[model samples]
Target: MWGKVVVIGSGEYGKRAAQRVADLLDPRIDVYLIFDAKSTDEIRKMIKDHGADAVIVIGAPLGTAFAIAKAAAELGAAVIVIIPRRPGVREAARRFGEEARKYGGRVEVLLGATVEEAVAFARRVVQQFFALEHHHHHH
Candidate 1:
């Protein structure tokens, strides 16, 4: 289990996605919201200040993925970028992954072809990636 999870993105969609993931995963996780900006520097600073362990950039515009990935890399945070598929957002995400690798960060681009798949994928990721396991106990 991870120590902290931060959702970076603004607006209702970001909040809803973050909340859904948090609710299904662990209630104790922290969620941080960030605005969409052109500058990677600003985003990096904010994320660093928040002390995030991992980052999920939810519902970001195609133009914003590169910068977000770069920022997350600089902060040493794992990044997951979710994008719509039919509208050519998949290409954008692919480009973002290239940029993320340049910055030495691992980026998983999830292309949800349908709403149902998107929701299901989100739930599964949270359960497998964020769900807490009790391995160590102090008796």
Candidate 2:
């Protein structure tokens, strides 16, 4: 059994993240993708349409990721943001995450040397720890 999930990707890594998470599911579960996107409104609607229990915003700038993150928070899905270890993206991801923690949502960050590396780790995270996040929410 799987929960609904949406991935917002504006780069190669983001696309990989979406594909990896969606792999092996012939449709028992659903995964939606928003590529080259930054619209929180669209993100929110996709989450709602998919009944997402988890949301991932990857390889996008903070403005895009944070917007999606905020919407996920308001809608009760655990949010994960992937940050490349570069100083600029890291700085903004941390800054924005610090603020998007309320609204009865949980947020997590996965950082790596390269977007490809982080995309792999992000996939493993979802495949491995998604249930843990859902089962153990403090709400």
Candidate 3:
């Protein structure tokens, strides 16, 4: 079966970006949205239950984002984290870079100047996943 993809976020900017990404890929991508995830367990449970192979988290705090990405990657899900370009990026790159190595390239962090750019990039990343899936089926 074509797998599921989950987009998670909280608060104003987070929620909006998550929704936009879901909307952008719906009717084809089987996208899910978690607007106010309270805990990492909840996030992991949802991903597991849905058999989601990819997760996109928008605008969560650095530590929170790391935790979610690590959990999802442990499940073998590709994780894309979206954050604004800012003073905190140095630490973000270091932390997420380590996670990416640990997870065998399943974790990725995207820095954007605005929510619009982040969502756009997220859509493209999801598209890339689908492209890979298509290639797998051709074998």
Candidate 4:
């Protein structure tokens, strides 16, 4: 079976990353982009409807990242959050991720210097998820 991946974007940085990832992995892996999600429930609905196996959050705020991670965790999906090199951002992401993990969410935070770096990292994370999913399906 094919794998499903969802990318949640907030601004230009996130939008561009999402598009690049989708362009690179379209037919092999189903990639869904969320640029207009207004709430956690909306993201949850999108993930559920798409049967997303993994979720990538780019350039979203702290609350948005936590919410998406919580939603994905509740649905037993993996989440990769890309955070910029802003002061206190990494610590914030780490703290929130600790809480998300408590709820059974597979959350990972990556440091991105630019949109290009974020997109490259996201591609690797998605590929790793795909490999894990393939192994899961066989067993």
Candidate 5:
């Protein structure tokens, strides 16, 4: 199992993803959430401090995501990102997706949908992590 898990943002999707993942993990997992209000430096610091095994970036800022992803990848933390359903975010959003993938992560974008889908996506990824952890342990 992962040594730590983190979720970012405080918006609907952010809350959904963070809370669901925290609940999904047993008491043993080190899990928490960081809201958008927190500075990117703070987020990055937390990541470094926790030896984060996974990073769940909700509808958090892309600048923050970009900064975190590079370091998180080096740590081998499974970084998951999902932008909320927006009418559209021009180049910046597109760039975030492209840039995030460049760092090696599933840029899970939940566009044109509701919170139901957002929460579901979070649950799905968390389950995948759980499965992977179990697989490694049993082997």
Candidate 6:
């Protein structure tokens, strides 16, 4: 059973992160890409349409972050939020996590101090999801 993971962001870094995750977890995983500008309704639809098992919001604008989190929560998708070293981004992630909890969805907020840390965190998440998918298929 291949897991479907969605990544929402439009920036270059966001796309690169998504690609990196995809490369690390391919074959057993499929990725859906969504930009922040897309409507919340559209985002939700994509999640449902793609049957995403997980969602990652990377380098999203503050408003989009909240929207994405809310949408992911409603869809019951595991969420990973990656915020840059900007001041407000952390607060946005905090709020997103809080909102995600209301829907009983798993949410992880990673604040990377350096590029290495950021890459490591992304790889960890990818590995975790891969393991989950592996166990799911085996079971």
Consecutive 10-residue window with the lowest summed lDDT within model 1: 112-121
TM-score of 4: 0.84
Clashing pairs in 4: none
| Every model's TM-score | 0.68, 0.75, 0.85, 0.84, 0.69, 0.78
| Residue ranges of candidate 5 with Cα displaced over 4 Å | 26-28, 60-71, 90-94, 105-107, 132-139
1 or 3, greater by TM-score: 3
* Best TM-score among the predictions, by candidate number: 3
Tens digits of per-residue lDDT, candidate 5, 1-139, equal 4468877755656666566656666666677767663566677788888778788776655455556655565566777766666555656666766765675655554444455666677677666666655343431
Error of 1 at 60 (Å): 3.3
- Which residue pairs in model 3 clash with each other? none
Please write out the lDDT profile of model 2 over residues 46-98, one tens digit for every residue: 78888888787776565677787788878888788875444556677677778
- Residue 139's lDDT within candidate 3 is 14
Which of the two, 3 or 4, has more lDDT?
Answer: 3
Where is model 4 poorest over a 10-residue stretch in terms of lDDT?
130-139
Q: TM-score ranking from best to worst?
A: 3, 4, 6, 2, 5, 1
Best by lDDT: 3
Off by over 4 Å in 6: 35-37, 112-116, 130-139
Candidate 2 least-lDDT 10 residues: 20-29
Per-residue accuracy of model 6 over 49-138 as CA lDDT, tens digit each: 988888877665657766776788788888877765666565666766787888876677786445445556766776676674434343
Give the Cα lDDT of each candidate: 0.62, 0.69, 0.77, 0.76, 0.64, 0.69
* Pairs of colliding residues, candidate 1: none
Tens digits of lDDT, candidate 3, 10-70 = 6667788888888887476677889877799988899999888898887757667778877
